[PDB]
Amino acid sequence: SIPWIDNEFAYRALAHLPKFTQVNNSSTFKLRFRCPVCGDSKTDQNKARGWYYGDNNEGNIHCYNCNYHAPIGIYLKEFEPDLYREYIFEIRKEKGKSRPIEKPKELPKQPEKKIIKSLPSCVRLDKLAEDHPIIKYVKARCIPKDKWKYLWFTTEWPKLVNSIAPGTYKKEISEPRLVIPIYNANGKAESFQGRALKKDAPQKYITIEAYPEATKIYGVERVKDGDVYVLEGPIDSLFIENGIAITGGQLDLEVVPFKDRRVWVLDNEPRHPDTIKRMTKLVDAGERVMFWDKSPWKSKDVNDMIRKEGATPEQIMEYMKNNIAQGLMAKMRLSKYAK
Amino acid sequence: MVEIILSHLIFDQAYFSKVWPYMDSEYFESGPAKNTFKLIKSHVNEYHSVPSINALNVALENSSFTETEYSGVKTLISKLADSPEDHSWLVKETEKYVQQRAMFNATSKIIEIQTNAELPPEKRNKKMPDVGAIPDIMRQALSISFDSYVGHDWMDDYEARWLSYMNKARKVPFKLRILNKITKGGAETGTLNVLMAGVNVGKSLGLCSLAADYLQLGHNVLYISMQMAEEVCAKRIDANMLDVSLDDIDDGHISYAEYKGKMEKWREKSTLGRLIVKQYPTGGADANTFRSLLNELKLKKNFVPTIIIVDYLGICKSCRIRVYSENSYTTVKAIAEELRALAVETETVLWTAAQVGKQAWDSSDVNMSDIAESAGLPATADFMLAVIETEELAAAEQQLIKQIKSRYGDKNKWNKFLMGVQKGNQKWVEIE
Amino acid sequence: MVEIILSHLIFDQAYFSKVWPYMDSEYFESGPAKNTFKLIKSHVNEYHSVPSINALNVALENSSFTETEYSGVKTLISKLADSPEDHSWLVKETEKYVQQRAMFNATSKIIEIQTNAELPPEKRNKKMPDVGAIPDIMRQALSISFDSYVGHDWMDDYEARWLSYMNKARKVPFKLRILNKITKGGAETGTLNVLMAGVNVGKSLGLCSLAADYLQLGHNVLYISMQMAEEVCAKRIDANMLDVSLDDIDDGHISYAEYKGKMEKWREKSTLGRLIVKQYPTGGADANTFRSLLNELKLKKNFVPTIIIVDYLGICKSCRIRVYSENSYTTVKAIAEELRALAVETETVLWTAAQVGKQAWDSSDVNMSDIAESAGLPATADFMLAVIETEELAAAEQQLIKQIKSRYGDKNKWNKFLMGVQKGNQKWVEIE
Amino acid sequence: MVEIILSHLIFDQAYFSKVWPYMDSEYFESGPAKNTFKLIKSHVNEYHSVPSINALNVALENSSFTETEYSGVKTLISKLADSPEDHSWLVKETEKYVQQRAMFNATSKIIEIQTNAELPPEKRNKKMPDVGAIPDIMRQALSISFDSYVGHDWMDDYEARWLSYMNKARKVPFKLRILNKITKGGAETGTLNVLMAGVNVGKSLGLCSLAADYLQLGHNVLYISMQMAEEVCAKRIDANMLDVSLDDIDDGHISYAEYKGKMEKWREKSTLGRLIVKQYPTGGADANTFRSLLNELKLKKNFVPTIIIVDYLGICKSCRIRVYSENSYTTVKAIAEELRALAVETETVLWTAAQVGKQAWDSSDVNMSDIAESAGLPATADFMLAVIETEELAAAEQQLIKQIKSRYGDKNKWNKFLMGVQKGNQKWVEIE
DNA sequence: TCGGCTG
RNA sequence: GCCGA
DNA sequence: TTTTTTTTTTTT
Numbered sequence A: 001s002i003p004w005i006d007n008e009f010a011y012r013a014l015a016h017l018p019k020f021t022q023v024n025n026s027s028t029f030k031l032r033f034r035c036p037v038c039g040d041s042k043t044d045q046n047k048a049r050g051w052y053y054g055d056n057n058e059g060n061i062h063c064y065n066c067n068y069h070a071p072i073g074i075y076l077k078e079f080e081p082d083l084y085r086e087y088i089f090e091i092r093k094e095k096g097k098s099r100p101i102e103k104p105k106e107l108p109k110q111p112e113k114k115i116i117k118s119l120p121s122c123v124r125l126d127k128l129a130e131d132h133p134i135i136k137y138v139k140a141r142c143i144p145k146d147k148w149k150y151l152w153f154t155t156e157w158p159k160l161v162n163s164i165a166p167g168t169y170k171k172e173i174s175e176p177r178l179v180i181p182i183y184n185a186n187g188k189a190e191s192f193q194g195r196a197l198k199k200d201a202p203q204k205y206i207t208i209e210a211y212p213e214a215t216k217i218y219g220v221e222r223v224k225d226g227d228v229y230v231l232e233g234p235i236d237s238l239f240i241e242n243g244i245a246i247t248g249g250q251l252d253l254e255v256v257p258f259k260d261r262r263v264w265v266l267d268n269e270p271r272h273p274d275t276i277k278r279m280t281k282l283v284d285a286g287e288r289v290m291f292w293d294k295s296p297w298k299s300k301d302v303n304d305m306i307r308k309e310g311a312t313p314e315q316i317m318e319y320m321k322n323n324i325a326q327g328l329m330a331k332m333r334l335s336k337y338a339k
Numbered sequence B, C, D: 001m002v003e004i005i006l007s008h009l010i011f012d013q014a015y016f017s018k019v020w021p022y023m024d025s026e027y028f029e030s031g032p033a034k035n036t037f038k039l040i041k042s043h044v045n046e047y048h049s050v051p052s053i054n055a056l057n058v059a060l061e062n063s064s065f066t067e068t069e070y071s072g073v074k075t076l077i078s079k080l081a082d083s084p085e086d087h088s089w090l091v092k093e094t095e096k097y098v099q100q101r102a103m104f105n106a107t108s109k110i111i112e113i114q115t116n117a118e119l120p121p122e123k124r125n126k127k128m129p130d131v132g133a134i135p136d137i138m139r140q141a142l143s144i145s146f147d148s149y150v151g152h153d154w155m156d157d158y159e160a161r162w163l164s165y166m167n168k169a170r171k172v173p174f175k176l177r178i179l180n181k182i183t184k185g186g187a188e189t190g191t192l193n194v195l196m197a198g199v200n201v202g203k204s205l206g207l208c209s210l211a212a213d214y215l216q217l218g219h220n221v222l223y224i225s226m227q228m229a230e231e232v233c234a235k236r237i238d239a240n241m242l243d244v245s246l247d248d249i250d251d252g253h254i255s256y257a258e259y260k261g262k263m264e265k266w267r268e269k270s271t272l273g274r275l276i277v278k279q280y281p282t283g284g285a286d287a288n289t290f291r292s293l294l295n296e297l298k299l300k301k302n303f304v305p306t307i308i309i310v311d312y313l314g315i316c317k318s319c320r321i322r323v324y325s326e327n328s329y330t331t332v333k334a335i336a337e338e339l340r341a342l343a344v345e346t347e348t349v350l351w352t353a354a355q356v357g358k359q360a361w362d363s364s365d366v367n368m369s370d371i372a373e374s375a376g377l378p379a380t381a382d383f384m385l386a387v388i389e390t391e392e393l394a395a396a397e398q399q400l401i402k403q404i405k406s407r408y409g410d411k412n413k414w415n416k417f418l419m420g421v422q423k424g425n426q427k428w429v430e431i432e
Numbered sequence E: 001t002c003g004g005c006t007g
Numbered sequence F: 001g002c003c004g005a
Numbered sequence G: 001t002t003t004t005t006t007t008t009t010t011t012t
């Protein structure tokens, strides 16, 4: 196919549609829009189910509201016959010639730009009194005290962010959150996560990046010799020696260092097929993945094991060190464990 | 001018009665206009009448659609209104718009065809025509005018029929007077003709002889051989057209000088056509194969045949039949029907061959009930001939023809005429 | 479409005359529509005449409801206009609306019945029916329609059937006294007729003779031919209408003045219909193709056929069966059934032809068991004639057309009858 | 692809002399490619020779070019290499690029024509072609092929056909004077041949011998055997090649020393071909398989066959036929057709065996009618030799071979011949 | 109340 | 539509 | 790729 022309024509033919948004991440080109086939919902104007994905080898317009998935050419034929003919002609026009899109291959990225120096409205956990409510909550979390020097407590999280990244929130409503600063390899904070307190925070539990190129892996500065264990929760990583945690919905293997010795320690849910998908994509790369297939505990995360089933960190480490499998060996445990 | 066309489709009887039958859903757009015409066409199919605006916007529009499409259709219908416009300019502009949109659709389709073909196989979206049939589609878009030409009215078109009579613009005469006197002028253009001889009684001596005869008459001949190689058929053609024994070409009694001189002498004549010989594997060519071959010959060699001689109908295959059937009747009849469809499409006399039954071998006479491949082939054939030289005519270098079937004339008038075969030269001469 | 229904109840008369018996106040709504229909029904009950708008206003004034719904009712009756729609679409749309609303009412009723059943008997309603009645009431909503006649009652409809006996209303004369004598009035409308004969025996000759005879009897004849080309069929017709032999045509033995004079002499007759000859590829026409052809012949010209002559049904294709998916029997039976369905839909005599088995091509007698292709063709055909030719018959230019099947008369009264055939003129003559 | 085409135009003689006649300045681009080809055309016109790279640079030095055009042309000239690619791929790829660019140019031209048409006629370009020529233009697009070879064109390839005649480019000798006498040079390539075994003849033996004789002539042979094991067929081959009696191999009279000595003596001769025996289960091998086997042999063993001897036709399987039977006419007909198609597509001689009826068994004279698989096999078998063994011939160690069907030559020239069959040696020798 | 989510 | 806040 | 009904056709 011709994905770049597909993206260009999709942008041309979807910009005028209401609730259009050109969501362009460094590897993905997507368009959000209210689907003209269905119209989505009057309440769900911003919750527009019309999506276009052009990052694939072909451009596909999919709407989950009316369940309409189709190639971009079909949409052009059904809605923009003039633009349809334009696209269908120009695709053949450039089809004969060699693809030149690789010629302007430039990187607009930048190095550390918003290096985080100090945290207003934040008091570190080890600096707090033993009867602080957050301290009691983390006692319930059973986090070892020595690592409390890595977590802060705040009450002005929107204010803190707008002091770091102004304009994030139109209102700086005071909000207590657990600020977990995410540092780089050299030890300087490149982002920070406002972990929700109590059962759940009111809104917007998100990790605020200092800049788009900031790291998403927590604890990299504390990585020592030996195998590196990759987990899903920074608090969970706090229970793991040489344990880093990826912070984000995107899982890129290239950005994660220690290709030789990185070990993926994921959740203990054989169900939740997205987990199985992640496991499969990791094993297809021949990566080192830990398997909970022989775990005596049946909780979800390591901290859950500790809190609910009374697991101890040493048991966790010995299970991880004895349950690392790679290649076909990993695939066996993956296959048996999934269901 | 879609709004005007629809407004005068709904609010004008004469305009509808004039322009509707040529109208189609693929003419207006991909928006509200197409859906409005869809509703109009649905109502016309259901009730054989032009609906009013009330029928459309209430009884019809209230069906499966989308909010955007419903709003657009309602807006368009509310926008429809009768306007006094002369009923000569309206029809002309409608015809021009229909022609323009037909050209637009044809161009889009051929571009899509090129894109599809450029894509490699296994994703080539079968049922889409190849690049070879790009021009005719565009030509189809050329002749899309509002000309009520459906069928051949017996009374309204006697002049054209008389022109066809007086020109005799269907007959392709033979080089033999004997066949012309029984076919009343020769074989006709869109016809499928069949030869039956048996085993090693003819059936390719006759086809090669007819190919040579049509060649000496300046006609384009395409000899599609299934049971013979590209060179043996050309060798029989050489034996016919050079007055040289076929054995003499093999042993070497003919020098290269004689052959080259005879060929150049034939070339210098202005009454010599082109005998293009093409071979396909036995059982591996259908009517689609022959259509592709005709398209290729037209494109590359600028060779549009008037005679197509297939060496054997029975060892062809059916394009429509997908699973090969052990039943000979249906298979052979389908092959013959496809061949006749090709012949009437290209207006080319399509000669071919059929195998006679085992009982007819070494029989002094052969009736039509001796056809072996299928009884359906004589049903869709146009002119069948039979070769019945048993032993005596072989000794006298003769061949008797019975003319088992004839659509060109009463087959009983000249039932037997004892064709003068010459096997060494692979030709036919009369016994005048 | 409640607005349309109410407006045409108030203003139209025939629509009220037919649709009023199948009307109930529950069909419309519980708002303005229900009150409007209640006013209409009350007015028609008091004075047995459809009211006027002024009558509706007076009824609103004297008989009033609550003001909140009174305003809605009064503003609902301000849009009922004359709007002279067509009658067929209006009746069909009213039928669809009442059927849909009856289904909705029945579904809501059964839901209410089940809900009442769920309640304890202490607090359950008594007016609602019991659960065992849920099926039958659904039937009561399933069979709601405006067809006052479900079928033909033998005693209740002794009238309206005697009319079909005085005026034949089905028979079409044959122009051949022998055919009428063996048919008692000729071929009936909405029926499929078959001429069955072997290869080159005269199936198309007989079809052309019948088409010409019908053309002389002021009948629209549509000669849909799959095997022969339009010009060939036209020539075979001209050989009959112009009384000039085919040899006289192919030898240029008729002056163009003679041809034009004879054609215009036929044209000047007021007892001459129209003959349209249409060509389709062999095996490329089905029932829907014929339906499209009929639609385009009705639209593009004022030509509605009364006789349809298909050249050969066997070389057609089934409109339901995928091509060559089933064997000869099933496919040909489906083709025959589709053709007969077309005939009954158009109320037109559909003549056609069929081949016989390979065994009967040299048989002095042809039995029904020799029908080629399906054996269901005689089952679905309405009148079958076998055309038989022998050397003795050919010696005097005659055939042996014999009644194989007949739904028009006792086939044994005149089973076989000699019918002289002038092949040169392609004409049928009766021995007298 | 433009860079490769220009580079191989500059730095080649065969590729230029092959593909120059089909190159136009509009085929490449509107930039560096077009200007470079313009320079090439100018140089080849002013001096009738392909420019060198420095010659092209000089032409760039002295020419009308803009600064950007000058830089682009200079860079492209410096980017031209003398890479020695293969020839066939280069021709095919440049032809594909030319055809694709021609299609793009024609599509752009017709689109611009249609855009010009939809303009006020007072304001239009006169030079633009009219709409009616659009189907012609696309035809000119598809009339682009570097090598225009579609079928054997008479009167245009008389020299090549005569060269094939003199060179005997189709015949393959038999190492037996009698067979070459009855075949005018032996069997031909792309053909099928069958041996009709009579009452106990040993279908394997003849195919065995021919297999041998073909081996001694240096031809690559592949004996696909069904009813026998690879070792048994190879043992018969050893019997024919080493003059060792077959039963002597079983008994052990011939020792390992003598066997290996004879094998190495045969290996010393440079006039010895290669024989590849491959076994397949009875009825588990159709023609399509054989194609895969040939692919494997060519890919792996580099063995390109010219003779393919299949052990038994009746034992074989039809390529696409579900129903299988031990002796059925439809199956043998399909098998013969598929095997001949394989022979044609492989340009190889194919041999097989078949059985005849009991009437052929009892009678010394065998007719084509007296064939179990007549009409079927005779139709698709180029050569047919009836091998009959009689008691008197058994006493004389001979067999009566009769040329039942010879597409190669006249049947009656030398029909019956006595053959010196040695069953123990499995050998055929001539008779003085 | 928001964003991101395969076919 | 499902998930997260 | 078998398997069974039915019909139709064809070959021996």
Ligand SMILES: Nc1ncnc2c1ncn2[C@@H]1O[C@H](COP(=O)(O)OP(=O)(O)OP(O)(O)=S)[C@@H](O)[C@H]1O
Pocket: B197, B198, B199, B200, B201, B202, B203, B204, B205, B206, B227, B246, B247, B423, B424, D378, D379, D407, D408, D409, D410, D411
């Ligand atoms: N090279 C030749 N020299 C002389 N006569 C030949 C030659 N080739 C074929 N014949 C004659 O041509 C006849 C053979 O039939 P053909 O005309 O080749 O077609 P056909 O063989 O009958 O078709 P089929 O399907 O193979 S049976 C016999 O009468 C042969 O004597």
Ligand SMILES: Nc1ncnc2c1ncn2[C@@H]1O[C@H](COP(=O)(O)OP(=O)(O)OP(O)(O)=S)[C@@H](O)[C@H]1O
Pocket: B378, B379, B380, B381, B406, B407, B408, B409, B410, B411, B412, C197, C198, C199, C200, C201, C202, C203, C204, C205, C206, C227, C246, C247, C423, C424
């Ligand atoms: N064009 C013609 N000129 C002269 N006589 C003809 C012509 N066409 C047919 N005939 C004669 O009329 C007879 C029957 O003709 P047709 O009805 O056309 O054949 P048919 O009954 O349609 O058989 P089919 O359908 O081709 S298997 C032939 O056997 C000829 O004797």
Ligand SMILES: [Mg+2]
Pocket: B203, B204, B227
């Ligand atoms: Mg032949």
Ligand SMILES: [Mg+2]
Pocket: C203, C204, C227, C312
């Ligand atoms: Mg006919």
Ligand SMILES: [Zn+2]
Pocket: A035, A036, A037, A038, A039, A040, A049, A050, A063, A064, A065, A066, A067, A068
């Ligand atoms: Zn949608």
